[PDB]
Amino acid sequence: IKNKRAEKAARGISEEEMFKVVKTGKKTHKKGWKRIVTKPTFVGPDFTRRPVKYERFIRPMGLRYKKANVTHPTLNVTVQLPILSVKKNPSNPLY
Amino acid sequence: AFCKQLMTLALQVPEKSSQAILGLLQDVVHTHGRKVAALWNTEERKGDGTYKPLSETVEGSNPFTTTIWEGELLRKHYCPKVREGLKAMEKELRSI
Amino acid sequence: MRPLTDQEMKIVLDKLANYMTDLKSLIAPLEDGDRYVFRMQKDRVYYVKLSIANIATCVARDKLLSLGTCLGKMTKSGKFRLHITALPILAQNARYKIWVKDNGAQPFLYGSNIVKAHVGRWTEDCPEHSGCVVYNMADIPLGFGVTARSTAEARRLDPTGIVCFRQADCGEYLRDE
Amino acid sequence: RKGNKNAKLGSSLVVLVQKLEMNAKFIEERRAKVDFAPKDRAQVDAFLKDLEWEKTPLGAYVV
Amino acid sequence: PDLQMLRTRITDTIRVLEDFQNLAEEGRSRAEYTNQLLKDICAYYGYNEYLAEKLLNLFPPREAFAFFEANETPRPVVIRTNTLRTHRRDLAQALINRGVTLEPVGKWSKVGLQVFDSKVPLGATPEYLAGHYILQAASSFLPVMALCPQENERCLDMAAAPGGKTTHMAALMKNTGVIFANDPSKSRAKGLIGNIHRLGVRNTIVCNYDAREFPRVIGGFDRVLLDAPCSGTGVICKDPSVKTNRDAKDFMQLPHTQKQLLLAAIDSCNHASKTGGYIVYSTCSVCVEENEEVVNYALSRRPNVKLVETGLPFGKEGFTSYMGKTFHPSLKLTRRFYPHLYNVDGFFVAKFKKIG
RNA sequence: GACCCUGUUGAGCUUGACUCUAGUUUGACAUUGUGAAAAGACAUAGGAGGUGUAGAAUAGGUGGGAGCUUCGGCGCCAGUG
RNA sequence: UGAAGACAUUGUCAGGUGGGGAGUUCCUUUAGUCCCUCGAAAUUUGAGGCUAGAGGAGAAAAGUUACCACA
């Protein structure tokens, strides 16, 4: 897998800065406005516009992950594979 | 809207009336300029509709979707003053 | 799809009158004997020609999704809300206009209210809470909103003072992409 | 026609105006792909040099 | 195995086939020279055997290697100026002022622009949000140039999921007439509606129908555009799943649906039209079972339509003969496009005129 | 501050029967004529034709076909398909 | 009696839609015989059809959400 990748290779702005820009217009700050999501997250696209429902949950850059060490049970090996989407978090539908 | 209609006016009026309108649009082009420049440039013509000559309202007509073609008749107008008057307007346009 | 009732047409035009001047021009007849009408499809109001409306009746109502230009939606409580899909209509006959500079266009497109430091051109004699359409220096409509203060009172305002409340921006197009 | 009763005169002018719309339409389609910038005017200077006045819809009427 | 070793064998096998008459071996035939070219192309470029032999039969040896080299390299990003809002010179100048490197895509389009790089996101720029350009693909330009719609007509776009082509017809129609934009998917239709409203299109109806129901629904269109869903053998660069997930089963159901779609497009149009009764069929595939075989089927079961000159400047003539399949001689008017020849996606355009 | 809930609101999802029909809309047909100038498809009688790759070479296709011969060129066979 | 004109208008069948008016209380999935029709390619498929499980009082409004704003 590594060798195949090796031969193949040989062949926007953050949510936080968007919040700073928006809060600049709205000078009056409501207490507890920012909700920093302190849990690890996966997003995907570099720039997106969120609904007003979720435009208050800020996910820091440092907590973002794009790949994972995924183990194949039958073929006993694990390879670092990119993450495409999160399907279900069995703790909170919001998560 | 008035600039396009005024060139149409200049086509079919007496020599002095045509000269007076020609001088008037020389000032209009000079004072505003880029607001009416696209009327004399075919590449800058708008493509969001068709020109409506007999509109009931000024905004109803789509005047940035047409081009001032009347210069090809007024360049051969019988009055030398009109011909010099037309050349005056393009000289202002070329200097925009 | 069905046309509006007389209560709904009044609500829709009241919101439009807040932003535009010559609403007669909206429904005035065209050259070819055609006119623009209002249609409702899943609590969404659509501005469309009558000829397009008549030939769109062949499409079943569960199979129709869009028609002409969408002004907005009627809310659950019976209150019309405009959407940025109606901005080309608003800018055509806008009553009050505000122009924002380059340093204010990007914050506006992200969803922030205009402040004094962003304004580069006003519209004189604009009352306190009025509907204005927002442009940049190239006369490109960015959106619309409601003014926070009168033009005379806004001139003496601090640079970091709200002069317009945002209601819709063209960045919402990135949302439904 | 709400005047005099000259239907022949009315028909003569009615067919006259129709030929004028056809000629106005005829030129309209032809000029839709012409560049007329104030600096270069080659295309307009040679708009319809190779066309005779008989082929126009008004020319077919006048003959 | 050793991938660079495979490349050497690939190059070695090709030159042998080019000069097999003088340069060969003791007794091995060129049949197993080509067969050797099959395995190492499959192992190197990651194709399955069914598609690779299919592609190798399409081209000769040294052009084929250029085709497989073109599929791995990405294609340049091109944008289409919205004629409904501006023209190319300002949009180039406006984006240049923001830090975008632009040239015209070529001498064949007065509307397309080619981008090298930028310092700002191209899909978030203010004139993008104003509706001044849309990110499109150069191959998507071609079908609407073949099907040039004039003002005050009724048009039918049978698959408008992205929305680039439907907006282009609206621009050429100057927001006059009626455009029936149709997608069999609700999820993808939302993006088309957003594209339409962003680009300022007022003369469209977005319907969510199966495209084979349209003569039943309305019928009578002046101009009908058909981008049939296909294998995607010309969009391999964006979608690598084509390289291995296309077998004989897929290449039998796909032309059947495409044949059914083409007949629906023919019946949808109006032969007695004051402006035109043109049908344009387009595909992002290079295979012959999806191009010039569906076209032949339409001409053999609808003798009331005829292929006409496509009108695009560049392109390669369609295939008249193939592996024992004899086509109508009129198919030479249809055009093909290849990534290695023109830096555009693999594509196919056909244009019909209805006469009864 | 965070947690649970209620009321109003916003964003979103789902339901909102069936049969005829007004309105609207697509296709075919009927009134309904006479001429003239063009275009298409049907009728014969002709003429001329087939170049994706490889194959020396411009292989419509289908059947027999190992011998034909203005008696010297062809065939077959070997290729390439 | 004059004008226009073989175009309109109108009429008959087949359909699409119908949140409007009157009356009353069809598609998709699953398993099966390889049972019939339609389309495609030839040395096989796709879609319908059949058997019985699952989805879709009524234009007034209703239900619902670990979401948002206010109280």
Amino acid, single-letter form, for residue A9? A
- The radius of gyration computed from the CA coordinates of chain A, to the nearest angstrom, equals 18
Q: Is the CB of E299 under 7 A from strand G?
A: no
Alpha-carbon distance E72 to nearest alpha carbon in chain A (angstroms) = 8
User: Considering only alpha carbons, which residue of chain A is nearest residue E73?
Assistant: A11
* Sign of torsion over alpha carbons C50, C55, C60, C65: negative
Chain C residues with CB-CB distance to A15 below 8 A: none
Contact between B72 and D34 using a beta-carbon 8 Å cutoff = no
User: Considering only alpha carbons, which residue of chain E is nearest residue B48?
Assistant: E84
- How many angstroms separate the Cα of E174 from the Cα of each of A61, E84, E85, E177? 45, 7, 10, 9
Chain A residues with CB-CB distance to E124 below 8 A: 12, 47
Alpha-carbon distance A1 to nearest alpha carbon in chain E (angstroms) = 12
**3-state SS string for E224-241:** EEEECCCCCCCCCCCCHH
Could you say which nucleotides of strand G lie within 7 A of any protein CB atom? 2-4, 15-20, 39-42, 44-46, 65-70
Amino acid, single-letter form, for residue B75? R
Report residue C100 as tokens: 């924002």
Chain A residues with CB-CB distance to E121 below 8 A: 12, 46-47
To probe the interface with B, which of C31, C49, C89 has the most B CB atoms within 10 Å?
Answer: C31
Distance in angstroms (rounded) separating the CA atoms of residues D32 and D18 = 22
E292: left (phi over 0), alpha (psi -120 to 50) or beta: left
Q: Is the CB of C61 under 7 A from strand G?
A: yes
Distance in angstroms (rounded) separating the CA atoms of residues B86 and C89 = 37
* Sign of torsion over alpha carbons A83, A87, A92, A93: positive
Contact between B69 and D31 using a beta-carbon 8 Å cutoff = yes
Residue of least CA–C1' distance to F39 = E355
Q: Is the CB of A29 under 7 A from strand G?
A: no
Nearest 10 degrees: CA dihedral of C87, C90, C92, C98? -90
Using the Cβ of A4 and the Cβ atoms of chain E, whether some distance falls under 8 Å is answered with: yes
The verdict on whether residue E165 carries a ligand-binding annotation is yes
The verdict on whether residue E130 carries a ligand-binding annotation is no
List the single residue in A25, A51, A55 with the smallest CB-CB distance to C162.
Answer: A25
The verdict on whether residue E161 carries a ligand-binding annotation is yes
Method: cryo-EM
Residues β-bridged to residue E178: E154
The verdict on whether residue E159 carries a ligand-binding annotation is yes
Interacting residues of E42 by C-beta distance below 8 A, sequence separation 6+? E48, E49, E52
Could you say which nucleotides of strand F lie within 7 A of any protein CB atom? 1-2, 8-12, 16, 23-28, 40, 50-56, 60-61, 79-81
Distance in angstroms (rounded) separating the CA atoms of residues E59 and E17 = 13
Of C70, C66, C177, C46, nearest to E188 (Cα)? C177
User: How are strands ordered across the β-sheet holding E133-136?
Assistant: E100-104, E112-118, E77-81, E133-136
Q: Which residues of E240-256 are buried (b: 16+ CB within 10 A; e: fewer)?
A: eebbeebeeeebeebbe
* Sign of torsion over alpha carbons E263, E268, E273, E277: negative
Report residue E269 as tokens: 């149009």
Distance E189 CA to G56 C1' (A): 22
Chain E residues with CB-CB distance to A45 below 8 A: none
Report residue E328 as tokens: 């109508």
Report residue E309 as tokens: 């000159």
Contact between E84 and B50 using a beta-carbon 8 Å cutoff = no
Q: How many CB atoms lie within 10 A of CB C14?
A: 10
Alpha-carbon distance C75 to nearest alpha carbon in chain B (angstroms) = 32
Distance A87 CA to G51 C1' (A): 39
User: Considering only alpha carbons, which residue of chain E is nearest residue B42?
Assistant: E87
User: Considering only alpha carbons, which residue of chain A is nearest residue C175?
Assistant: A49
B49: left (phi over 0), alpha (psi -120 to 50) or beta: left
List the single residue in C48, C56, C176 with the smallest CB-CB distance to E194.
Answer: C176
Report residue E142 as tokens: 């071609």
> Hunting for tokens 């002409």 — which residue is that?
C68
Task: Write phi, then psi, for A82 (nearest 5 degrees).
Answer: -65, 150
Read out DSSP for D1-48?
Answer: ------HHHHHHHHHHHHHHHHHHHHHHHHHTT----SS--HHHHTSS
* Sign of torsion over alpha carbons E154, E160, E165, E170: positive
Alpha-carbon distance A90 to nearest alpha carbon in chain C (angstroms) = 26
User: Is there a contact between E115 and E133 (Cβ–Cβ < 8 Å)?
Assistant: no
Interacting residues of E96 by C-beta distance below 8 A, sequence separation 6+? E102
The verdict on whether residue E346 carries a ligand-binding annotation is no
Read out DSSP for E104-119?
Answer: ES-SS-SSEEEEEEES
Q: How many CA atoms lie within 13 A of E218 on its CB side?
A: 28
Report residue C20 as tokens: 């535009």
List the single residue in C49, C66, C174 with the smallest CB-CB distance to E193.
Answer: C66
Burial classification of residue A69, based on how many CB atoms lie within 10 Å of its CB (0-12 exposed, 13-18 middle, 19 or more buried): exposed
Task: Report the interhelical angle of E49-58 vs E61-72 (nearest 10°).
Answer: 120
Chain C residues with CB-CB distance to A48 below 8 A: 174-175, 177
User: Is there a contact between E32 and E24 (Cβ–Cβ < 8 Å)?
Assistant: no
Contact between B67 and D44 using a beta-carbon 8 Å cutoff = no
The verdict on whether residue E107 carries a ligand-binding annotation is no
Task: Report the interhelical angle of E30-45 vs E61-72 (nearest 10°).
Answer: 10
As annotated, the active-site residues of E are 284
Q: Is the CB of C65 under 7 A from strand G?
A: no
Distance E160 CA to F21 C1' (A): 36
Distance in angstroms (rounded) separating the CA atoms of residues E85 and E64 = 42
Report residue B64 as tokens: 């940035």
* Interior angle at CA C147, CA C159 and CA C113, nearest 5: 55
Alpha-carbon distance C37 to nearest alpha carbon in chain A (angstroms) = 30
User: Is there a contact between A59 and A15 (Cβ–Cβ < 8 Å)?
Assistant: yes
C21: left (phi over 0), alpha (psi -120 to 50) or beta: alpha
Interacting residues of B5 by C-beta distance below 8 A, sequence separation 6+? none
Q: Which chains touch A (3 or more CB pairs under 8 A)?
A: C, E
User: Considering only alpha carbons, which residue of chain E is nearest residue B50?
Assistant: E174
